[PDB]
């Protein structure tokens, strides 16, 4: 039976059925986890999407930029899972960068307000979610966030790369706080995944140069990866998250696990 059996896990970041978060939730549920889901803004759409998951699960609202949503999140979760119960797991699968700081726009022409909003949502929110939810987490529990390796610069990704560099630093401090509760904190640095958003870029929505750049990155990724890399398949990364959520990596924290086919270990 299941890898996450009898675990209570909060999963953020579902927006479509091609969301990495969607697959994380699916696999987790397939593995016996009992879930609490969170969503931003488009709650009617999200509710419809999440009905396509294997099992029923409460959907709660969370705009990570809303100080009231965060302050109330713990109480609202406890209500959904029942009093006298706590969370074993939390999944941060949230990211955003205005098109001004990421894509076709030059690196220098991103105005700070846009940059700041992206860091807020993509990095700081990892800390604020942890603050909100640690008091209602069990020992042995696990917090997991989604990363994209920012240790080297690349075209297009631009300020989102900077946000991921920030998020990695954030995760190391959150581990310090999380350790006090017997709770681990880690990032999964995933390889490129064809989300709906990504698929549109590949199809030319951000121009032919941008479409060409993403296509070079993907082809080179699969080449470099010793076991290959399938941009269309989010399942291997979801399993990696489930692994970190499980009891089978109990000594790992403040750390980054790479679900990228080994590509980052190879120059070419």
Residue numbers in the entry: 2 to 269
From the paper:
The frontline antitubercular drug isoniazid (INH) targets the mycobacterial enoyl-ACP reductase, InhA.
Compound screening against purified M. tuberculosis InhA identified three initial hits, AN2918 (6-aryloxy-benzoxaborole), AN3438 (5-aryloxy-benzoxaborole), and AN6534 (7-aryloxy-N-sulfonyldiazaborine), which had inhibitory concentration (IC50) values against the enzyme of 44, 12, and 79 μM, respectively. AN3438 and AN6534 had activity against whole-cell M. tuberculosis with IC90 of 16 and 36 μM, respectively. To understand the binding mechanism of these boron-containing inhibitors, co-crystal structures of AN2918 and AN3438 with InhA were solved to 2.5 and 2.55 Å, respectively. (iii) Similar to AN3438, the oxime group of AN12855 forms a hydrogen bond with Glu219 and stabilizes the salt bridge interactions between Arg195 and Glu219. To validate InhA as the target of this series, we isolated six M. tuberculosis strains with resistance against AN3438; the frequency of resistance for AN3438 was 6.5 × 10−7.
